Design a binder for this molecule. Structure first.
Ligand SMILES: CC(=O)N[C@H]1CN2CC[C@H](O)[C@@H]2[C@@H](O)[C@@H]1O
Length: 494
């Protein structure tokens, strides 16, 4: 075997300087970490990845021989970057914080042969190409969304999806935990939302919800994968589950039935009833107590049954509730037309046919200093069909093949918005049509690593013809990990 080339990694690393003979992990290699819990956690994570396929003991130690060295040190790598040095003497990953060590490990696993992901002992050799990678991200907002409201996904399925996104240096997990078809978090001040509002899902299945303990475990697990959880309570539209659970929240005071279909636009909270804000205050307060992350997403899309002036007055009242609990507002880009507060981010989900006036409104807010998360429906929506023949997913945004999802520049995308306003990107996975985790993987892969690269990699590394060869190189690893994926004909799979 020869080593996988040092640059064959997604995201493309910011700097790659290949040179010298490779490191070879052998029966005597140790994983040497600084003397601390933060250090041992990353070392034990790495050992868990490497022990099954190598069959080596790979002790995590703070003394002795090393071979794979994980070290924290001051340096120019910021909060999330790292340097990886590899040669005959060993592999050393250096960073300022545990998050850059963890990022360096996600790089190290792609450098290693695909057999590394197997769950039993495999022949070597275990080669890491020689040279130096120095790597820091282009954008700080690099996120993946999972809709657990349309179809429910369990704590264990969400942890499996966290492990998918952690491969590619995503650092935010947006969980869409409420919509018309379900409410997915126990709220003590409004107990019916989860108990009744969570009792079904699209298609009339058993639905589900996270207890407070379940939600804490999802947050703790994602943190151990350096993902900051960004929960969304969508409002004032996409609220049927909440309205069905509490008659008083409805303008007419009558609870609609639980909804199991896939239409949108029809539900609204009652903007002129004060009890609506008792409900928002209580839910956001309880969600904030469970959210160590900095952001609360209040949604704001498809409020088609809410008059514009009511939508504006609603967001005027609700956004300060987020600041009252010490968090920052994120909304879908409809919020740009309703006075985003200072610090608020908007998430653009539009597409090429979105009207010019609507695009100009979002760009106006960006010029006004509103930060922008880009997730265009005809680029990074992972539920969008690849072609007319994809058996799952939607096509309201057109067909989105692998090249189209990758081949754009978040810095030069929305006309009239400054580059400086772009906080980063997100890849959302909506679940109207997806009800099991193998289906999630088929729709998420192979576009998911592409959005991760847009978030992470320098613009100077961006290039379809050479990226598609790095993407083809992931397939053997996916196959060893058991990850289903769409074998696009645009990619030169080996
Ligand atoms: C933010 C967002 O994409 N909202 C809705 C946007 N709509 C547009 C058409 C679909 O119903 C789609 C739906 O799946 C999504 O939930």
């Amino acid at each position: 075997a020869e080593p996988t080339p040092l640059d064959r990694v997604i995201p493309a690393p910011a700097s790659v300087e290949p040179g010298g003979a490779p490191y070879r992990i052998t029966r005597g290699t140790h994983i040497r970490v600084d003397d601390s819990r933060e250090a041992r956690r990353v070392g034990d994570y790495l050992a868990d990845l490497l022990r099954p396929a190598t069959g080596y003991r790979l002790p995590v130690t703070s003394h002795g021989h090393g071979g794979i060295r994980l070290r924290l040190a001051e340096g120019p790598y910021g909060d999330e970057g790292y340097r990886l040095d590899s040669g005959r003497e060993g592999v050393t990953i250096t960073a300022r914080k545990a998050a850059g060590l963890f990022h360096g490990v996600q790089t190290l696993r792609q450098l290693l042969p695909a057999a590394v992901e197997k769950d039993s002992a495999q022949p070597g050799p275990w080669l890491v190409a020689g040279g130096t990678i120095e790597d820091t991200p282009r954008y700080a907002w690099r996120s993946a969304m999972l809709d657990v409201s349309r179809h429910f996904f369990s704590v264990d399925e969400v942890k499996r999806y966290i492990d998918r996104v952690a491969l590619y240096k995503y650092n935010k997990l947006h969980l869409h935990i409420s919509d018309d078809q379900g409410w997915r978090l126990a709220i003590d001040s409004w107990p019916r939302l989860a108990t009744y509002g969570g009792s079904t899902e699209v298609g009339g299945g058993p639905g589900g919800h996270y207890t407070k303990a379940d939600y804490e475990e999802i947050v703790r697990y994602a943190a151990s994968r350096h993902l900051e959880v960004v929960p969304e309570i969508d409002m004032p539209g996409h609220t049927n589950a909440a309205l069905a659970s509490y008659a008083e929240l409805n303008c007419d005071g009558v609870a609609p039935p639980l909804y199991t279909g896939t239409k949108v636009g029809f539900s609204t909270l009652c903007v002129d009833k004060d009890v609506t804000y008792d409900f928002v205050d209580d839910v956001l307060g309880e969600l904030a107590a469970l959210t160590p992350g900095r952001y609360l997403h209040i949604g704001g899309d498809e409020a088609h049954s809410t008059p514009q002036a009511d939508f504006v007055a609603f967001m005027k009242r609700v956004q300060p509730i987020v600041a009252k609990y010490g968090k920052t507002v994120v909304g879908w880009h409809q919020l740009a037309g309703a006075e985003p507060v200072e610090g608020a981010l908007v998430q653009y989900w539009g597409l090429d046919r979105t009207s010019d006036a609507e695009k100009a409104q979002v760009a106006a807010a960006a010029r006004n200093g509103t930060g922008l998360i880009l997730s265009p429906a005809d680029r990074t929506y992972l539920d969008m069909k690849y072609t007319k023949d994809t058996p799952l997913g939607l096509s309201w945004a057109g067909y989105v093949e692998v090249r189209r999802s990758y081949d754009w520049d978040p810095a030069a995308y929305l006309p009239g918005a400054p580059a400086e306003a772009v906080r980063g990107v997100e890849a959302p996975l909506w679940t109207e049509t997806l009800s099991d985790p193998d289906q999630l993987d088929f729709m998420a892969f192979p576009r998911l690593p592409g959005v991760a690269e847009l978030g992470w990699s320098p613009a100077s590394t961006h290039d379809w013809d050479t990226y598609k060869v790095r993407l083809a190189g992931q397939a053997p690893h996916w196959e060893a990990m058991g990850i289903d994926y769409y074998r696009s004909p645009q990619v030169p799979w080996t």
